[PDB]
Write an enzyme that holds these catalytic residues in place. Structure first.
Site, PDB file in Angstrom:
ATOM      1  N   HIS A 211       7.938 -26.274  -6.138  1.00 47.67           N
ATOM      2  CA  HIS A 211       6.435 -26.501  -5.881  1.00 47.67           C
ATOM      3  C   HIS A 211       5.147 -26.545  -7.066  1.00 47.67           C
ATOM      4  O   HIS A 211       5.957 -26.906  -7.708  1.00 47.67           O
ATOM      5  CB  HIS A 211       5.845 -24.371  -4.958  1.00 47.67           C
ATOM      6  CG  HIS A 211       6.633 -23.847  -5.688  1.00 47.67           C
ATOM      7  ND1 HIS A 211       7.758 -23.888  -5.792  1.00 47.67           N
ATOM      8  CD2 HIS A 211       6.139 -23.021  -6.680  1.00 47.67           C
ATOM      9  CE1 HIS A 211       7.440 -22.243  -6.984  1.00 47.67           C
ATOM     10  NE2 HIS A 211       6.249 -21.610  -7.054  1.00 47.67           N
TER      11      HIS A 211
ATOM     12  N   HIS B 214       1.331 -25.149  -8.553  1.00 46.00           N
ATOM     13  CA  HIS B 214      -0.122 -24.061  -8.893  1.00 46.00           C
ATOM     14  C   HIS B 214      -0.720 -25.043  -9.471  1.00 46.00           C
ATOM     15  O   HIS B 214      -0.279 -25.809 -10.193  1.00 46.00           O
ATOM     16  CB  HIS B 214       0.765 -23.004  -9.820  1.00 46.00           C
ATOM     17  CG  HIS B 214       1.770 -22.460  -9.345  1.00 46.00           C
ATOM     18  ND1 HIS B 214       1.625 -21.168  -8.667  1.00 46.00           N
ATOM     19  CD2 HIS B 214       3.858 -22.841  -9.594  1.00 46.00           C
ATOM     20  CE1 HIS B 214       2.983 -20.679  -8.059  1.00 46.00           C
ATOM     21  NE2 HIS B 214       3.612 -21.215  -9.364  1.00 46.00           N
TER      22      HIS B 214
ATOM     23  N   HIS C   6       7.474 -25.837 -10.551  1.00 46.47           N
ATOM     24  CA  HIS C   6       8.319 -25.487 -10.569  1.00 46.47           C
ATOM     25  C   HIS C   6       9.904 -25.814 -10.285  1.00 46.47           C
ATOM     26  O   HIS C   6       8.990 -26.034  -8.905  1.00 46.47           O
ATOM     27  CB  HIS C   6       7.951 -24.041 -10.035  1.00 46.47           C
ATOM     28  CG  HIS C   6       7.004 -23.317 -10.965  1.00 46.47           C
ATOM     29  ND1 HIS C   6       6.267 -22.486 -10.160  1.00 46.47           N
ATOM     30  CD2 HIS C   6       6.676 -23.715 -12.811  1.00 46.47           C
ATOM     31  CE1 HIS C   6       5.899 -22.301 -11.831  1.00 46.47           C
ATOM     32  NE2 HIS C   6       5.553 -22.724 -13.171  1.00 46.47           N
TER      33      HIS C   6
ATOM     34  N   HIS D 195       0.817 -19.933   0.478  1.00 46.10           N
ATOM     35  CA  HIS D 195       0.729 -19.553  -1.121  1.00 46.10           C
ATOM     36  C   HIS D 195       0.631 -20.815  -1.962  1.00 46.10           C
ATOM     37  O   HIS D 195       0.468 -21.022  -2.848  1.00 46.10           O
ATOM     38  CB  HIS D 195       0.609 -18.314  -2.071  1.00 46.10           C
ATOM     39  CG  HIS D 195       2.096 -18.150  -1.834  1.00 46.10           C
ATOM     40  ND1 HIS D 195       3.153 -17.648  -0.646  1.00 46.10           N
ATOM     41  CD2 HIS D 195       3.045 -18.771  -1.953  1.00 46.10           C
ATOM     42  CE1 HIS D 195       4.021 -17.504  -1.002  1.00 46.10           C
ATOM     43  NE2 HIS D 195       4.885 -17.941  -1.547  1.00 46.10           N
TER      44      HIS D 195
ATOM     45  N   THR E 223       7.368 -15.837 -11.302  1.00 44.66           N
ATOM     46  CA  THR E 223       5.108 -15.092 -10.986  1.00 44.66           C
ATOM     47  C   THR E 223       4.592 -14.998  -9.849  1.00 44.66           C
ATOM     48  O   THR E 223       3.424 -14.602  -9.371  1.00 44.66           O
ATOM     49  CB  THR E 223       4.599 -16.812 -11.234  1.00 44.66           C
ATOM     50  OG1 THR E 223       4.490 -17.762 -10.460  1.00 44.66           O
ATOM     51  CG2 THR E 223       5.176 -16.964 -12.529  1.00 44.66           C
TER      52      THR E 223
ATOM     53  N   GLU F 155       0.628 -22.064 -15.367  1.00 45.07           N
ATOM     54  CA  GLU F 155       0.822 -21.124 -15.381  1.00 45.07           C
ATOM     55  C   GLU F 155       0.747 -20.109 -16.213  1.00 45.07           C
ATOM     56  O   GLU F 155       0.458 -19.499 -17.291  1.00 45.07           O
ATOM     57  CB  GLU F 155       1.670 -20.411 -13.938  1.00 45.07           C
ATOM     58  CG  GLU F 155       1.536 -20.284 -12.216  1.00 45.07           C
ATOM     59  CD  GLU F 155       2.147 -19.847 -12.241  1.00 45.07           C
ATOM     60  OE1 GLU F 155       3.570 -19.550 -11.672  1.00 45.07           O
ATOM     61  OE2 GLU F 155       1.405 -18.708 -10.906  1.00 45.07           O
TER      62      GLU F 155
HETATM   63  C1  LIG Z   1       8.252 -12.675  -0.632  1.00 40.53           C
HETATM   64  O1  LIG Z   1       8.807 -13.556  -1.040  1.00 40.53           O
HETATM   65  C2  LIG Z   1      11.078 -13.769  -2.026  1.00 40.53           C
HETATM   66  C3  LIG Z   1      11.389 -13.318  -0.322  1.00 40.53           C
HETATM   67  C4  LIG Z   1      12.660 -12.821  -0.591  1.00 40.53           C
HETATM   68  C5  LIG Z   1      13.566 -13.500  -1.602  1.00 40.53           C
HETATM   69  C6  LIG Z   1      15.172 -14.141  -1.349  1.00 40.53           C
HETATM   70  C7  LIG Z   1      12.588 -14.550  -2.112  1.00 40.53           C
HETATM   71  C8  LIG Z   1      10.934 -14.514  -2.326  1.00 40.53           C
HETATM   72  N1  LIG Z   1      10.910 -15.135  -3.350  1.00 40.53           N
HETATM   73  C9  LIG Z   1      10.845 -15.928  -4.347  1.00 40.53           C
HETATM   74  O2  LIG Z   1      11.722 -16.151  -4.258  1.00 40.53           O
HETATM   75  N2  LIG Z   1       9.658 -16.640  -5.169  1.00 40.53           N
HETATM   76  C10 LIG Z   1       9.241 -18.027  -6.270  1.00 40.53           C
HETATM   77  C11 LIG Z   1      11.054 -18.613  -6.182  1.00 40.53           C
HETATM   78  C12 LIG Z   1      10.259 -19.559  -6.909  1.00 40.53           C
HETATM   79  C13 LIG Z   1       9.670 -19.688  -8.096  1.00 40.53           C
HETATM   80  C14 LIG Z   1       8.788 -18.892  -7.991  1.00 40.53           C
HETATM   81  C15 LIG Z   1       8.428 -17.397  -6.774  1.00 40.53           C
HETATM   82  B1  LIG Z   1       7.676 -19.385  -8.889  1.00 40.53           B
HETATM   83  O3  LIG Z   1       7.966 -18.445 -10.120  1.00 40.53           O
HETATM   84  O4  LIG Z   1       6.709 -19.514  -9.048  1.00 40.53           O
HETATM   85  O5  LIG Z   1       8.161 -19.895  -9.531  1.00 40.53           O
HETATM   86  C16 LIG Z   1       9.386 -20.814  -9.095  1.00 40.53           C
HETATM   87 ZN   LIG Z   2       5.652 -21.126  -9.093  1.00 38.45          ZN
END
Ligand SMILES: COc1ccc(C)cc1NC(=O)Nc1ccc2c(c1)[B-](O)(O)OC2
Ligand SMILES: [Zn+2]
Length: 257
Positions: free
Chosen positions: A91, A93, A116, A61, A195, A103
């Site tokens: 990362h 978007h 981000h 993604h 997000t 976003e």
């Molecule tokens: C399946 O995904 C997970 C499974 C388990 C854990 C502990 C965390 C995640 N996901 C995660 O941290 N996403 C994530 C982390 C940071 C950001 C975003 C998404 B964003 O808002 O786009 O920008 C900043």
């Molecule tokens: Zn993000």
């Protein structure tokens, strides 16, 4: 599984992740005339001199540049934050066209992309525990507009050929994230969420007012990445952004007068 296509995109996420319709979802539109200056906001502190990058991964993604967060090296503090947040990854978007991709939006304006920089609250011990807390993460959001090239971004652009498809990763040591910051640290801040699924409401968003400029060639290379894995039908990795969500009962604060 979720994604950004017509059949599994943002409008479908709420079926597997009901918090999608929650009270503090992100991103949101930043109405500049309604955000209020908050003189009590302490100055922001971004200390990335000791940042230790390790790897870059295409996760299907976006692509994440991961850092060693086993020690307090690169940290974010100050601003609306109480405590110390450790950098774990960054990362972006982006869109299929320069006119969309971010976003968050500013007075409904969409930027070509949004960076981000993700940090977790060290009081919670590890990232997995932090996302379960309302003040578990602090994400620094930076808008990208197309114009002059961003020198500090080129090392990222040049390694993308090696992680074209989902699940591919490459060594990415010694990358300095300071090279991705604009000159000014003026920002807007509000409580929000991840997000992408699981869409957890664990983020203090800090969105910088000044965008950085990247070249058309730099963002064009982002658009050559793939959402699919190797050997699967090619789906270009573009428009991996979630649209603005209801502000609801929240106020966006500005760090500048
Ligand atoms: C399946 O995904 C997970 C499974 C388990 C854990 C502990 C965390 C995640 N996901 C995660 O941290 N996403 C994530 C982390 C940071 C950001 C975003 C998404 B964003 O808002 O786009 O920008 C900043
Ligand atoms: Zn993000």
């Amino acid at each position: 599984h979720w994604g950004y296509g017509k059949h599994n995109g943002p409008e479908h996420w709420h079926k597997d992740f009901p918090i999608a319709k929650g009270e503090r979802q992100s991103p949101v539109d930043i109405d500049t005339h309604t955000a209020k200056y908050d003189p009590s906001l302490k100055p922001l502190s971004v200390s990335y001199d000791q940042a230790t990058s390790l790897r870059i991964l295409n996760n299907g993604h976006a692509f994440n540049v991961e850092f060693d967060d086993s020690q307090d090296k690169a940290v974010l503090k100050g601003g609306p934050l109480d405590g110390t947040y450790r950098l774990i990854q960054f990362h972006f978007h982006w869109g299929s066209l320069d006119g969309q991709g971010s976003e968050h939006t500013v007075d409904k304006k969409k930027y070509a992309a949004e960076l981000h920089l993700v940090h977790w609250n060290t009081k919670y011990g590890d990232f997995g525990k932090a996302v379960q807390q309302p003040d578990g993460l602090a994400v620094l959001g930076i808008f990208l507009k197309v114009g002059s090239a961003k020198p500090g971004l080129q090392k990222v652009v040049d390694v993308l050929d090696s992680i074209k498809t989902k699940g591919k990763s490459a060594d990415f040591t010694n990358f300095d994230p300071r090279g991705l910051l604009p000159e000014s640290l003026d920002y807007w801040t509000y409580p929000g969420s991840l997000t992408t699924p699981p869409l957890l409401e664990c983020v203090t968003w800090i969105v910088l007012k000044e965008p950085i400029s990247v070249s058309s060639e730099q963002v064009l290379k982002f658009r050559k990445l793939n959402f699919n894995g190797e050997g699967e039908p090619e789906e270009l990795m573009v428009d991996n952004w979630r649209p603005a969500q209801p502000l609801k009962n929240r106020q966006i604060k500005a760090s500048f007068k």
